[model samples]
Target: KLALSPESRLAAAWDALIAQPARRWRRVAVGVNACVDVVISGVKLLQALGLSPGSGKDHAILHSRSDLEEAFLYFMGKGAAAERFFSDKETFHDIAQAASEFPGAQHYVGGNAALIGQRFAANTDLKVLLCGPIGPKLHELLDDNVFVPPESLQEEDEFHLILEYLAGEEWGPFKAPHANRFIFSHDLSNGAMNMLEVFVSSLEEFQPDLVVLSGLHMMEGQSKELQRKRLLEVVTAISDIPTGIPVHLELASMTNRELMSSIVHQVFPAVASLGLNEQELLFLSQSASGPHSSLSSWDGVPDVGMVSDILFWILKEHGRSENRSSDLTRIHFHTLVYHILATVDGHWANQLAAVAAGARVAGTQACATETIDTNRVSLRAPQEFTTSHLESGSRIVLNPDKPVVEWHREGITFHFTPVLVCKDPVRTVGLGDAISAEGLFYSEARPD
Candidate 1:
């Protein structure tokens, strides 16, 4: 295994997984929000607005072009952001309209549920049920395997103004540290969780093997009373699912401590699986009053040791074990260079293969290619890397012939593999959703 280079090993692992017999899971239900993305360039959009690299602070609520620039620059200074909302509906619609007129701007299904559902529909034979108000454009954008209630087809359309940037793209004094995006949205249905009734009612008949809940961040910036009621409804609906069926909650950019606290303490414990990026992981630990609370943000790829401790803590405190009824058994953490699949021992199977599938998508999807072209891919994780920073620190040096590594602590098992990052990434928006969805597409669950 040591004879080949790490990249060679990664490629071989991907090929092996692709050659394996495909196993089709029965069905996957994804929910609670759906919108069409009006995509454009972050730097270009700013130029169109006649804003230079000037200064302003991040506003909790976005109101105008000036305010949008402030919010955009705030995250632009950092590497990436999850999601944010516009305080005024007219402002949001104006930007979406602006993006549509911008040169080269594109539109697609943009919400977490819709994007994730799209991956499952495109890559596998599994039936998918998407829960959202699907207007004409959204319906036209969705794939054939996706099923939404017939009534949703005529529901009001919504839009997310998505401005994506390349890794080194610059605005006046600020240059994005990584490939990322800034999203601005104002929608009534998604924020109110209006589709919850339809989504919950369809679950019995769908009898899905997997259920994924996302877009809860849409509830942020709303009145506190509304958030409380909606969150309670979510917990109730998710908790009602039988333990035999796995549920995954995919987290996004949330700045509201109160809203996040409810999710970390209440919503996280009920799900069988979870997926999040670097920022969401940090914010979860912070809001939970864990070690990272004082530090809600970080730049570049985060340290693997800190990540281990948090993932470890999540399982020990909130995750499932013999003494607890919590169903949180697996977590998929995807960062720039590597991805960690942490599971509580026997609750899941084929984790190594599932993780490899996720890593494979990192390149193919970023480049928008069906098969990987080695020239377009480059290794981001170094040859030798520290696996953990707790207790006695240890390193898992990649044996190029075998890039994937697995480690265990307490009752949890973590499988790690480096991604072949795209040399010229064409897509940064919803890449994590693709990783998590594709991984779930290959994952096997063993209900307790």
Candidate 2:
């Protein structure tokens, strides 16, 4: 069986790439993450021509450039600049080399401005414009120039009431105004409307050239499928928002292509029905780069680090290698894992019952047929230990081989077996609480 082990070569390559040195440049390369060496070499050449050491207005302006758009996703892995490039080894070496060779030369020290800003912006000028208010607020707070006092009980209640009032307000802030290109994304669910309304309001004030949307959080009662459909409504709404502003939806676990296509077909027939020119077509695909990868492997099984590995892998996979972009891949990874874990846990009771019934039923026949009884093996306990009385309560220690689900309730101990599966104890422990019983399981396979 193929296990989800850390075995991706691309992930390794990226780790090595990030380990390399950060380069000094007057102008930021649009997609330097794809070809770091080339971008660094170009930066060196520009320095030879007496350009500024650090990036300037031109590099900052690269955020709107179409060619380097998709690189925004790379930031989700490790900010805009790979962490390896910023580490002491890489930074120190570069600094030493520059100082020894060109005593009077200016070396860029801040980040790769063009690459970093664009990635954080996520290839959607519209996103930056829409979130402009919040970013400035954050910066002011960071700089200690603005203070938002803790709310009192009355004030907190007022805030909630204001939120409800805002929710009922016209969804105007979520739509976009006239523009050529745009990208928008949000956590799937009701956030879609809020995102559109904000984007629309922002577009009216600061017109953008392009926009890409990460979907909003979407949940519908108990059905994930219906939630997906509701999220797709946001995608469709994109085309209808404005004629000139072309919006693209990033396909995610919450989004469905059929619904997006339906919206595209109905709202923007000219662009959807082969009438879109080449430039416009490129905008559609470039806007929605999803989470890829940031790391390659893990030696331990119970390592919650697997989540990071998966996230890093997706970031590297989708990042703009050429532009050195950083997208919001970390947020996407967290969301995806949340959904997977929740969905898996949602069916725990049924799964455990099914396993127990099948085992009992099969055990009845296995002894009769003289077939090597796997059921008996599963039911066996391999070890035992002493019980203890602590301030919390009495606790029993089981043999390492025991099949048990443990719970601590008001100083009482509860252990249940036969466990549902036994391939890797880590999988059982990580997800078992979702279906069978909710508690901690101590396994000799790996110490917690």
Candidate 3:
């Protein structure tokens, strides 16, 4: 296997999986949260407001990112007023009119569970059980083609504020324009726990092969202790699921250091797999490294070596600590450039294949959504970018000592450099969730 060509190996693995008899009826349960997302690029927003992109006044607003975030949070916390504003077309129109300083907003089905479930269901024939708040808009958008909502659901959809800016561009005090900021409705957090009962009941009947948990990181109002307790309860329930079923936790927009630490120290041990972006990974690493850690000094783009070092350090410390659990099987760290999967006693070959599958799926997503201005993205199977990624994966040169398929005393690590197929991404939203869902599917479907 070590001597085999990367392209050959990737193709073999992918083909074998594809050749298998289709299990179109396999169940995948994703839940506990969903929302209506309003997305608008920062550049477009500024243009709509008739403000220059890099103007002094614009810079002032950009520099006050925290203030803006706080203001949004405050608005969302205003109870019914916030709900009515978001849910009412006329109200939202009035607000938009008032803020002629912003524009070009488009709505989509948001939230980790909903996005991942939608992408996964669209790609595969898996019967999806989406257990979250499905309002009239999201329900109509989904059209019940793939996702089957709970029969007894009675909750209004939450709203998410998303601003997508150019990558590496300067915004006020922050230089990362390509980054996104999310402000979730506080009400979404309130009703999350209530969905668990319905989720568990659906689990028993659906008998799913996989269960995904998301939106816990956004829960507010409760103390960190109480939040952790609630999360633990959910993880414990999922853990008791039938042995063949694996539970995955997807961390999204988690900024609170205490909550991040709590989830890593407490909830992580209970789940089979965990997924998070590079920013979340860095924060978790800094939290794990104590108050005065040097990881705080890290700046600019991080290479695979630096990221692997930080991740390995976290894993090693956790593996030795009392917080570590034998049930924790995989940790997926994803970034714009690459994605890495660390597994406990898993085959490196299988991990590599899964990485290739993820890159291909993500590239396809990039191509489909290639820019709202250019062409509307069309959903397709995950076969488009397989050759490109396989070729790119073959050309990657790994350090002999810390190879992509390196093994440690604790586990095996598979590092995958994603094929940057889209030089200019049409849309950056939902790429991570798409890759995560596709990667998990391929990894789990591997031939025994």
In order, candidate lDDTs are: 0.81, 0.24, 0.56
Between prediction 1 and prediction 2, the one with superior lDDT is 1
Candidate 3 Cα RMSD after full superposition onto the native fold (Å): 9.6
Q: How would the candidate models be sorted by TM-score, starting from the highest?
A: 1, 3, 2
lDDT tens digits, residue span 79-157, model 3 = 1112211334443433343232243477777767878788768755677788777666667666364555456255344
Clashing pairs in 1: 5-400, 6-400, 286-293
Per-model TM-score versus the true fold: 0.84, 0.21, 0.67
What TM-score, to 2 decimals, does candidate 1 have? 0.84
Candidate 2 per-residue lDDT, tens place, 1-448, comes to: 6632121221222223221112111111110000011012222322443443331111222222221122212221112221111123333334334322343332221111111223323222112322211222123222132111121001100000000111122121221121111111111212223233443334433343333343231222225455455445544544444443433222222233444333333323221101111122222233333121222322332122233222232233332133533221111111101111101111112222222222222222323323223333233221232221212333344322322234333222222222212222211111211111111000001100
Write the candidate numbers in order of decreasing lDDT: 1, 3, 2
Residue ranges of candidate 1 with Cα displaced over 4 Å: 1-6, 17-23, 41-103, 163-183, 289-299
Cα deviation at 429, candidate 1, in Å, is 0.5
Query: In model 2, what lDDT does residue 78 have?
Result: 18
Q: Lowest summed-lDDT stretch of 10 residues in model 1?
A: 16-25
Better of 2 and 3 by lDDT: 3
lDDT of 1 by residue, 1-448 (tens): 3565456567876787543224557889999778888878887987887777777468887777888888888888786774676777766666777777688989878788888999999855688999886787788889988998674565446877887888887876888888888887777888887887788888888899899989889788788888888778888887777668888999897889889888877887788899998888898888775655566577567877778778888888889866877889889999988899999988888888888889889889999889777778888876666666655557777764576688888789888888889889875778999999988998988746
